[PDB]
Amino acid sequence: IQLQYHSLLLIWLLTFNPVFANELVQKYLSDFLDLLKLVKITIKEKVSRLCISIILQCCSTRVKQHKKVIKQLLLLGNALPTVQSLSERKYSDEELRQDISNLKEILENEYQELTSFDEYVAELDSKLLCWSPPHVDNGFWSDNIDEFKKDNYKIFRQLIELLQAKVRNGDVNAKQEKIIIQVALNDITHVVELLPESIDVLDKTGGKADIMELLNHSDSRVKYEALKATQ
Amino acid sequence: EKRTLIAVIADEDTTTGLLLAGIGQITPETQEKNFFVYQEGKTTKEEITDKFNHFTEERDDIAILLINQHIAENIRARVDSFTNAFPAILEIPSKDHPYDPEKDSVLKRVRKLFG
């Protein structure tokens, strides 16, 4: 508990400067919700207050791109449902209560202009996971098929690089490696299923070779998604 | 009268029973029966869209479509792209799946304008 409180204090002190928080959002964006989760699990009043204060500082108006960062945090890390639970939950720490209320207001403001497209962009930036938000159902994907491609596959070239990195990791047996091998191939199959023109760009960029290598050997999810890609 | 038929795209629990007790299942001079069994995991999605076209555009006697959510979710693009008036496509819940008032085409249009 003492070590966690010290880490939270250090994170808050560093994050008091808006520039530091803005820079960290570009390298430790997942940590933004990780701190919130740690506070939610943490029962100590002071530690929770410090974590909520750090989270709010990350979303402080001074921090560059505060609105977009807050919206992304709410959409991805479930900071808005977490803030709703905190509002429902009760604690004796008045300072912690005020910090949690401020974080909840920030989350509500961020989610008032939120969309799953931000989560899709973040997932494409990660490219080291097994599943993605768009796999939930056929609703969002109906537009997402033409979202990453920018209607011409041009914007999807970043998705192409992400898939190339996931294929480079696919040759290894790491859990993240297999997850990425499956996820990139599944997204490629989903995108190719509609408007096959961009498939040529994927095909010229090694799409056929990538699909063959995913199902080459020593793979379970990689082949499991290469089957969809080649079907 | 010009257009009177009822058409049902639903599992056996609905097309065979329930309304079928008073609605019937066959046309006066056709064997198509204006219905599709839609076997779970057996009927093709492409075949489902083909049947939707069959009962919405290929034959004129059908006055209403009454389609279960199971086909509708997979047939989302086709039913959303259909904008005519006569077949009056109507989505229904089936088995355990409820209405889900944020999915079907007509209510989507209604919320789109004006509320």
DSSP collapsed to 3 states, chain B: CCCCEEEEECCHHHHCCCCHHHHCCCECCECCCCEECCCCCCCCHHHHHHHHHHHHHHCCCEEEEEEEHHHHHHCHHHHHCCCCCCCCCEEECECCECCCCCCCHHHHHHHHCCC
Are A87 and A101 a contacting pair, CB within 8 Å? yes
For B77, nearest residue in chain A (alpha carbons): A142
Matching residue, tokens 């969309």: A115
Asked if B76's CB is within 8 angstroms of A138's CB, the reply is yes
Are B90 and B7 a contacting pair, CB within 8 Å? no
Residues from chain B that touch A139, judged by Cβ atoms under 8 A, are 76, 103
Hey, what are B106's tokens?
């007509």
Find the radius of gyration of the CA atoms of chain A: 20
Interface contact A137, partner B, CB < 8 A: yes
Distance from CA of A117 to the nearest CA of B (A): 19
Interface contact A136, partner B, CB < 8 A: no
> Of A109, A7, A14, whose CA–CA distance to A51 is shortest?
A7
Are B75 and B45 a contacting pair, CB within 8 Å? yes
Asked if A137's CB is within 8 angstroms of B76's CB, the reply is no
The structure was resolved to a resolution in Å of 2.7
Are B73 and B104 a contacting pair, CB within 8 Å? no
- What is the rounded distance in angstroms from the CA atom of residue A97 to the CA atom of residue A89? 10
Residues from chain A that touch B103, judged by Cβ atoms under 8 A, are 139
> Of B3, B13, B87, whose CA–CA distance to B52 is shortest?
B87
> Of A75, A89, A86, A90, whose CA–CA distance to A32 is shortest?
A75
Cβ contacts from A onto B, under 8 A: 8
Asked if B103's CB is within 8 angstroms of A138's CB, the reply is no
Experimentally, how was this structure solved?
cryo-EM
Distance from CA of A140 to the nearest CA of B (A): 11
> Of A230, A213, A125, A217, whose CA–CA distance to A168 is shortest?
A213
Interface contact B73, partner A, CB < 8 A: yes
Asked if A142's CB is within 8 angstroms of B103's CB, the reply is no
B44 alpha carbon, distance to own chain's centre: 16
Residues from chain A that touch B74, judged by Cβ atoms under 8 A, are 138
Distance from CA of B76 to the nearest CA of A (A): 8
Interface contact A143, partner B, CB < 8 A: no
Instruction: Report the run of H or E that residue A108 belongs to, with start and end.
Output: helix A94-111
Residue A213 belongs to domain with CATH number: 1.25.40.150
Residues of the domain holding A167: 118-231
Distance from CA of A147 to the nearest CA of B (A): 16
Question: Cα angle vertex A114, ends A112, A119, to 5°?
Answer: 160
Residues from chain A that touch B44, judged by Cβ atoms under 8 A, are none
- What is the rounded distance in angstroms from the CA atom of residue A137 to the CA atom of residue B73? 9
Hey, what are B14's tokens?
């609905």
Residues from chain A that touch B77, judged by Cβ atoms under 8 A, are 142
